[PDB]
From a paper:
Interestingly, from the late 1970s through to the early 1990s (strains Bgk/79 to Shn/93), a marked decreased in binding to N-linked and biantennary O-glycans containing only one or two LacNAc repeats beneath the terminal sialoside is evident. Position 159 is present as a serine (S) in post-pandemic H3 HAs, evolving subsequently to a tyrosine (Y) or structurally similar phenylalanine (F) from the mid 1980s. Crystal structures of HK/68, Bgk/79 (A/Bangkok/1/1979), and Bei/89 (A/Beijing/353/1989) HAs reveal a generally conserved pattern of either 7 or 8 H-bonds connecting N5 of SIA to the backbone O of residue 135, O1A of SIA to the Oγ of Ser136, O1B of SIA to the backbone N of residue 137, the side-chain OH of Tyr98 to O8 and/or O9 of SIA, and a combination of the side-chains of His183, Glu190, and Ser228 to O9 of SIA.
Influenza HAs bind sialic acid (N-Acetylneuraminic acid, NeuAc) containing glycans (sialoglycans) on cell surface glycoproteins and glycolipids as their primary biological receptors. Previously, we and others have demonstrated that over time, IAV HAs within the human H3 subtype have evolved more complex receptor specificity, selecting for elongated α2–6 sialoglycans featuring at least three linear LacNAc (galactose linked β1–4 to N-acetylglucosamine, Galβ1–4GlcNAc) repeats beneath the terminal species-defining sialoside moiety. By utilizing a variety of structural techniques, we provide evidence that this enhanced mode of receptor-binding has evolved over many years to include mutations outside the traditionally defined sialic acid receptor-binding site (RBS).
Numbering used by the authors:
A (entry chain A), D (entry chain A), F (entry chain A): 9 to 325
B (entry chain B), C (entry chain B), E (entry chain B): 1 to 172
The structure:
């Protein structure tokens, strides 16, 4: 006569398969998912300050494309560029477009400070069909198209000191006329030249008159360039025609700002992690939603699922 | 796994145990019963909660990085940007695959450990009053009522009280 | 390794066992013999085959990448391309070195486990009819012919049949 | 009276040493190699379509160097460039040579589609000593050397629309004469100029007359440039001399194609992984053959051997 | 950890043992004593020294690399250089964090192993002359003077010499 | 009557906490630090040959800024650039400054070999206020400012063969005058031009006369360029004014040399690993001192401490 005492462990009828060093598939009592693979579909407007570019790229907002006027002096943590975006001003190109877009997006501000450059000898605020503001001829709001006055364009030699305690970002350009008639009609000289410079640097542009395909009414073009002036340095512009002058500077900041291409709608919610697919929770360590992220995000991996066992091996029968 | 208790010398789990991960089942002069062991359940659950917390620690806050989609053919620089992102994703994908394989192997083995620890703690406790049948069960060689079974589960079993009776039943 | 059986309380391996990884050696009234245990051999071999399959899974199909040899001095861009490839190779070289150290340590320990599991399964089976001499061998306290040794290896040994004889030989 | 039953494990007389977390050298019963360190020596022509460049670089095959004429309209998964390769046409340079080589190799095709550009006013198919086809004067097969006709070179203004549903790759160039005599003899103007353009872009080249060292009979040079035209865009070329005109386009594809520098002989066999040393099996997860690979390949590591234990610890005695 | 000896069925460590990592404490007819076990101490220390040597192997000799500090805003190329270094540091930081977690978990478990191995080696040695009380101690069922305790620690204990006396004390 | 034999392990009263897979904090008997987080503060001058740039950047030492004359023909394993560094010669810019700095630092030598270029027709060794050597007008020691002689600047066409068994690094420049008066006074031609070339390459610079801000007395500038000549190739310079000629070559080496920005003092000691913070021991596998390292160094990680358990778990009571 005696008794029996058995030692045992629990089990569940609906176990889950996980991977180990030894086994491609082994059933455990419970597991949890480590790969985030879904999104709500909206980008939460909290906690980051989100600026919907809507119909405007960052570059067009910077230059001052008339349909981008609402973006003047704005700040952002994340600038969201939409694929609908279009230019509706003077046809332009930006050599090293990607770098200018990156540095302005990283700075995170469109703060523009007007400065009174000394443009004696030429007529300011040149405008054009290609850049309507309403129904009147206009131009990029942050650019000043200088053309001859009373039939001459004198050797401009203008300076601007950076005596402030921050960096200045100056945006300027060069006009490329379509024909020689245009060149002399606007600048009165058969060949122009633009030399902006600092104590470190000197970027000189020669305009190249010639034909480019029809874009928004014009075969002419403008090339966009930038110069950053450090405290104690000075901006010097010397031009004998074709100069698209700056009206001031943008202040460069350093911080956590960036830019993202997304068509996802902006929603009123809070989420630390943003993807082009929309915001995602960051409670899991990994994610398969998008290689592009912003904020406190799970790390992107190629797997769409990784099951972490949270229970013993399941031995039902 | 590595200790041979779970999925090993124990035949299978008890689906009717919904109040603990490890426990006791008995048959005596008063009937049969089942009782969970809280010590071993907490031990396993605490270590698994420990690795859960080690994994939610992640510190991947990134802001302005590099572009990862391109609409134009550019060449060398784009080749390098693509190669960098592809290289990074492959290494992190490997880290994730290796991490779950290590963690899951260790999880299975640690639960196997806790099962064996409860067994051994019980085995040493009974001393010469019981024998291991090899299937995770002990034949208790004396009358052992519910209080007696209770005393084993609760750690207050005094083997000296039953030793003479059990020895006489053991050895002819 | 971790369990102390192989390279531990077992003195050394049996070079004459060419039909299994674990097994039995006996001496009785009929002679001496050697027989492999298929259960434990398959257990170890299956887990090692499991990690072999986990390693042939590799998904490294790469096509157009970056250039990795240069005949001209270029500077910054070349510096970055070289740094990227050097960085990638160092991290993958580390992954490979860490992987074999983990895998081999686990392999040695898992084979040590299987040895101990066969031992314990056998120990519990014999009950009070044998004693552990500490060198991986049991002294069986009763006449145990080839069928009896067979019954132990095959799992059909009935300890109740020999219990009285073994107890009498054990205890003076 | 009793019996003895001993538990044991196997052993082998020729164990192998492996590494663990704890031990620099420990003997196990068996191991397998995880680092591939050998090659057969040939590049298998299966399963990838291999194109032996032989005496020709990809760029010379693209331009149409006469000894590369056999490479017209070819396709490849892997273009193999040989170190024997040489140019035997007009001396040239390609600014950003590496990028052009990469994008054509990634496209994986030399498909050229001839298009009838409207070259009224100049004489086509200018040729030269430096570029013999047989024993007669010739030129790059895909380039059209335009020079003056009846002593003038009129302002060329030629367009070409991309109305197809794929991208066009246009290859063109600029001639750099050695002396002022040459410049006026060929182009009749003291200074040339070439402006190819799209709706996005404009690359203008000024030719710089001057001396360059003797190469294949000439001190003159040509600079090679490219322009990619997207569907709905248009190619516009405006040039007042020195234009090396395109004869058509190459179609750009996207896919798995690439280029590799190797002197390894091409063999008839099948292997997924290709190195400059030759093809290697991919049954092992790692390899020490070459950092350069193509296809389904083991990952390159610095170790030449990594032993994975496939048996227990070996305890012989 | 995984074996349940240290921080497990052993209640706590012996702060007065300053000549070894594992050892014996006894009480007999001659008094009480403490003696370290050199076998198990060397076993643990050797494996830990082994992993120390595996970690001082590092082969990170780097010379001309890429620039990692910048005084001017440059854009794309600088973005890529920063991203490459940030990517590399995150992956190596992960390698270091994972390495210590694996190593320390394995260290704790391997010392737990060595403790249990010394226990089992001693348990099998005593045969039927002692019993496990479950707290890391054996009740020795016979007179066992200092030479007798010595014989156990030194591996020369002959259980047959005391077997009759111990069996008689065990079984009523 | 019997005896008691207890099995046990040691313990210490002052345990240390470490991390495991399972535990955020667990006490072990002993641990060792794997992250190096401190520095002595000096850069050890052994075993690497260290060259303190002191008041000179590498570029100024290369060009021959007078206060950098002590750096002529020097070699280094590590060139240490100080933040005190300044230029005190002609104001200059270097397009792709970073690349030139990198390749010279990687070469590890300032060995300059003078060569007798054939400058018939112009006057050599032009000097300037901005570049005093002592109290007399001087110039960059490795550059030769060519200006007109007896009122003309003839079409220079000079060659230099690389018949040696190593690579030649040639440093040259272009002068940018402030005004048209200057241009004709020095070069006698309204527009200059410089074309250095090899069999592979051709870099042509047009000087752009105009205003730049006042730096060390001058509004003029110089742009610095380089050309590498391979064995069997030849250097050809053709210039009609504004050429800042080379006086010879630097020999390019390949090796273990580099450059580092640091204000750390140079000490007499031995240490394999160098950081901008100073030398650090490399006995630990990881370090948190600086992402910038040189030599046999621990790998940089973000953690400042990582405790490796070197003993069992500590169970005091
Ligand atoms: C070098 O050669 C190129 C062409 O080979 C010249 O560039 C052309 O310049 C003419 C301007 O005279 C352009 O013609 C204009 O095209 C406009 C755009 O048409 C497109 O878009 C509209 C919808 O927006 C569609 O309806 C149309 O099918 C096209 O898809 C037209 O809208 C213009 O027509 C209107 O204005 C003119 C008055 O000027 C009227 O006669 C028309 O009836 C209508 O009211 C106009 O026809 C042409 O597109 C340009 N082509 C290119 C490729 O750029 C260069 O000028 C030349 N260079 C030099 C130096 O001569
Ligand atoms: C600026 O200055 C440079 C030189 O300083 C001038 O460039 C030189 O131009 C002349 C052309 O008159 C070149 O001379 C030619 O060199 C050929 C190549 O010779 C090399 O290769 C062959 C084997 O292929 C070897 O035998 C030889 O040793 C060299 O290694 C020769 O083959 C030519 O000779 C043949 O033709 C001429 C007829 O023209 C006959 O007189 C000869 O006997 C023989 O039949 C020829 O001599 C010279 O190489 C160029 N040098 C460089 C460095 O480019 C520029 O022209 C000048 N600029 C201006 C504007 O004047
Ligand atoms: C386009 O326009 C710019 C200016 O808008 C012109 O550039 C200026 O050129 C004049 C030269 O005539 C420069 O004036 C000189 O500045 C020197 C530097 O002064 C700075 O540093 C000193 C300390 O080193 C400080 O004391 C001072 O406050 C400044 O911080 C002065 O040292 C010079 O003065 C000395 O020399 C002159 C004689 O030439 C005497 O009259 C003085 O009393 C004193 O002895 C001198 O004044 C000026 O700095 C330049 N500005 C810029 C922005 O470059 C371009 O020339 C013009 N382009 C054309 C084509 O005309
Ligand atoms: C199965 O998945 C998770 C994991 O179970 C947890 O881990 C065990 C080791 C033990 O701690 C259990 O008590 C836990 O439930 C469970 O989801 C988590 O549940 C906890 C507590 O209920 C909750 O706070 C967390 O938010 C959950 N975490 C996640 C990532 O979802 C889940 O409930 C388990 N289900 C079953 C039936 O066991
Ligand atoms: C020693 O190396 C490998 C590994 O042995 C295998 O792994 C063991 C765990 C067990 O599964 C053995 O039966 C295996 O042989 C052996 O090479 C492999 O052999 C298998 C089967 O024979 C074959 O299919 C594979 O192609 C081989 N793999 C490789 C990478 O070569 C080898 O035969 C072993 N030799 C000895 C003597 O044990
Ligand atoms: C605590 O930290 C280290 C580690 O202890 C070593 O590792 C043990 C497993 C065992 O091998 C001990 O004997 C070791 O001391 C000790 O520092 C090392 O000490 C050794 C020998 O004394 C010396 O050669 C090394 O230079 C030291 N290494 C480092 C990285 O400092 C230390 O002495 C230990 N202290 C105590 C009280 O245990
Ligand atoms: C964003 O852009 C869309 C489309 O470009 C605008 O919608 C057009 O607005 C124009 C204004 O000139 C109207 O003529 C059209 O009726 C609209 N067309 C379409 C297809 O929508 C829209 O107004 C813009 N919205 C904002 C907020 O800027
Ligand atoms: C590849 O190139 C080699 C060497 O350039 C060619 O061999 C030469 O062919 C030329 C043709 O003009 C002959 O004059 C020589 O006799 C050959 N010389 C040498 C050294 O081989 C070969 O013909 C080319 N092969 C292919 C397939 O293009
Ligand atoms: C390094 O530079 C410092 C500062 O530029 C030099 O010290 C100056 O030397 C100038 C020489 O013209 C003296 O006029 C000043 O008295 C010094 N000023 C300061 C602030 O130190 C120093 O001589 C240079 N040392 C070396 C070794 O080149
Ligand atoms: C602006 O330029 C004019 C013409 O050079 C000059 O007379 C004037 O002093 C300058 N400054 C201001 C503040 O007008
Ligand atoms: C996220 O969007 C990308 C395209 O931007 C798409 O390829 C991917 O499948 C999407 N993933 C999820 C989880 O929505
Ligand atoms: C080609 O150019 C000539 C001259 O400009 C012109 O007359 C002709 O119409 C153009 N088109 C065709 C198809 O010839
Ligand atoms: C492969 O070729 C490279 C040179 O291309 C050589 O350095 C390396 O040693 C070769 N390796 C093998 C395994 O052949
Ligand atoms: C140098 O140039 C002059 C003028 O062209 C020429 O007469 C002379 O032969 C050249 N060579 C030498 C070595 O002077
Ligand atoms: C090393 O120097 C850097 C700046 O160069 C500083 O940010 C960092 O804190 C320093 N670290 C140590 C350990 O001195």
């Amino acid at each position: 006569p005696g008794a029996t005492l058995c030692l045992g462990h629990h089990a569940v009828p609906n176990g889950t398969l996980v991977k180990t060093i030894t086994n491609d598939q082994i059933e455990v009592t419970n597991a949890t998912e480590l790969v985030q693979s879904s999104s709500t579909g909206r980008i939460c407007d909290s906690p980051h300050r989100i600026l919907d570019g809507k119909n405007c790229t960052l570059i067009d907002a910077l230059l001052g494309d008339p349909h981008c006027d609402g973006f003047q002096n704005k700040e952002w943590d994340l600038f969201v560029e939409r694929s609908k975006a279009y230019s509706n001003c003077y046809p332009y190109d930006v050599p090293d477009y990607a770098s200018l877009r990156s540095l302005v997006a990283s700075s995170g501000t469109l703060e523009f400070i007007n400065e009174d450059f000394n443009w004696t000898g030429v007529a300011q605020s040149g405008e054009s069909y290609a850049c309507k503001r309403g129904s009147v001829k206009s131009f990029f709001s942050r650019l000043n198209w200088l053309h001859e006055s009373e039939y001459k364009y004198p050797a401009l030699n203008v300076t601007m000191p950076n005596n402030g305690k921050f960096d200045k970002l100056y945006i300027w350009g060069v006009h490329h006329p379509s024909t020689d008639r245009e060149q002399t009609n606007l600048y009165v000289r058969a060949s122009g030249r633009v030399t902006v410079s600092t104590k470190r640097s000197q970027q000189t542009v020669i305009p190249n008159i010639g034909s480019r395909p029809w874009v928004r009414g014009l075969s002419s073009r403008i090339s966009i360039y930038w110069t950053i002036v450090k405290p104690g340095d000075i901006l010097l512009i010397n031009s004998t025609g074709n100069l698209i002058a700056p009206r001031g500077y943008f202040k460069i900041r350093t911080g956590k700002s960036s830019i993202m291409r997304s068509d996802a709608p902006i929603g009123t919610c809070s989420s630390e992690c943003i993807t082009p697919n929309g915001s995602i929770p960051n409670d899991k360590p990994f994610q398969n939603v998008n290689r592009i992220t912003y904020g406190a995000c799970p790390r992107y991996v190629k797997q769409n699922t990784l099951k972490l066992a949270t229970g013993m091996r399941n031995v039902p029968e | 796994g590595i200790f041979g208790a779970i999925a090993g010398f124990i035949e299978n789990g008890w689906e009717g145990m919904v109040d603990g991960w490890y426990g006791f089942r008995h048959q005596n002069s008063e009937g049969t019963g089942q009782a969970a062991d809280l010590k071993s359940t907490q031990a396993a659950i605490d270590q698994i909660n420990g690795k859960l917390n080690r994994l939610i620690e992640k510190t991947n806050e990134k802001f302005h990085q590099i572009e990862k989609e391109f609409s134009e053919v550019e060449g060398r620089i784009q080749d390098l940007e693509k190669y960098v992102e592809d290289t990074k994703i492959d290494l992190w994908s490997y880290n994730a695959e290796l991490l779950v394989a290590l963690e899951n192997q260790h999880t299975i083995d640690l639960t196997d450990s806790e099962m064996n620890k409860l067994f051994e703690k019980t085995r040493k406790q009974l001393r010469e009053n019981a024998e291991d049948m090899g299937n995770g069960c002990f034949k208790i060689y004396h009358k052992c009522d519910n209080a007696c079974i209770g005393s084993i589960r609760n750690g207050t079993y005094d083997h000296d009280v039953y030793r003479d009776e059990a020895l006489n039943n053991r050895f002819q």
